[PDB]
Design a binder for these strands. Structure first.
Lengths: 108, 108, 110, 110
DNA sequence: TAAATGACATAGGGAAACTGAAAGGGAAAGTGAAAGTGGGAAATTCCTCTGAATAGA
DNA sequence: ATCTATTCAGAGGAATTTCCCACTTTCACTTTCCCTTTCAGTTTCCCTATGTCATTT
């Protein structure tokens, strides 16, 4: 059937399984996504969990079959979101030293 | 007593029990048909209500017994109307974002 | 007149060899190649979508002059048409190559 | 407004010779000089970082009508782009000269 | 007023990751023209049954 | 010498058969929706690499 990204993303947000990935508003319209830049030493694949989740979810990534590739999972997650109408990028807290991340918000 | 499509269609148009299926002429010579595209995430089953109604009506589709098949219902409905003389597709508003549909018309 | 069927038409283009880059890759004439340069590249230009364009002109999908040029769509339609077609398969994919980007299709059977 | 590609744009600046000490050295144009100096020195301005500034203005990254000129960043962006070009290698690093600071790239190719 | 030794404040710099805009791709869905189909209607053989015309008793 | 016992035309539906007519399905691509990839550059990250000030001999 293949998941559509917005409904899928919203579900992850509601379940709140991944960390650094949740609703940052009680009305539910703004949300955070970890985004530790790739070159940083403290950066593991645990910091690309949503990106990885999406890849596993769409069949792109299958642990065992393909080597894990972090940059691709991220560029893929990002491009999918950009084209999505009714959803804009708010603040770019990506290079932020302690808690690097981004908040997306649904608009009309 | 299998229904003939034009009389049947006109009846649905007059009863107006199907959202989006309605005349657009006081004179009743132009009607509109809901025409959302199958892939669209926003396509709920009822977006093929007339197509489904015709399939159930010709006894081709009995809920419970058959697996829903939305493409064929629309496909059958469109093909059935095409042979009909005195009837012609006037506008194709189906790749339309908000309210997608097609307008047929009766050539005198 | 009749509308051309894609495989016979393609074979004909291959035999005529009018388009540059489009050629049989073997004597048995069963494997052929199609130039497939990526659209965003700098050296890209309309002549790198010649077969795609030819097919569009051929099916009346495009009419130099009256209609407006949609190069990507020409490729999408040509690519999509072959994809369902039975008895033809994708063999190679050198489409992301630098100097000679192209894909290689092979004719098969059942 | 169409975005310029760096090599064709750079070659144009070299031919026009609008900046001081940019024109190629060899007439066949297989080598050229770049106002590559240093930033932690003394009289370093927008004159010694002209190509770097030209590229920044050219890509809209910076416009002498809003963006507050950052000479250090401009040098970083220009350096990275030249590095990735296959048929383009850096000959010598003559930035190691007092009064005459610069750099010599090659228009080689394989 | 000095060659040297230190002391910070950033400017390079090489890789590899990031990115926006737009082209590519998958594959499920759509299409008009063309050809196929089912089921009810019209038509073309089958079946008693009638019954007057023909044999046994 | 009637008195039944049969029997081959013509009836009046059955029993299929062949036709027709609306839709249905194929045919052979085309298009759409939603993301993915490519392009050709930008931007980090993480270290060095120097170029002005400030103490050693």
């Amino acid at each position: 059937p293949k998941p559509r990204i917005l409904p899928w993303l919203v579900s992850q947000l509601d379940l709140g399984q991944l960390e650094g990935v949740a609703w940052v508003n009680k009305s539910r319209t703004r949300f955070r996504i970890p985004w530790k830049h790739g070159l940083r030493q403290d950066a593991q694949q645990e910091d690309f969990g949503i990106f990885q989740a999406w890849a596993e979810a769409t069949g792109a990534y299958v642990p065992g079959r393909d080597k894990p590739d972090l940059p691709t999972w991220k560029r893929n997650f990002r491009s999918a979101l950009n084209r999505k109408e009714g959803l804009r990028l708010a603040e770019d807290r990506s290079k932020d030293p302690h808690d690097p991340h981004k908040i997306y918000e649904f608009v009309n």
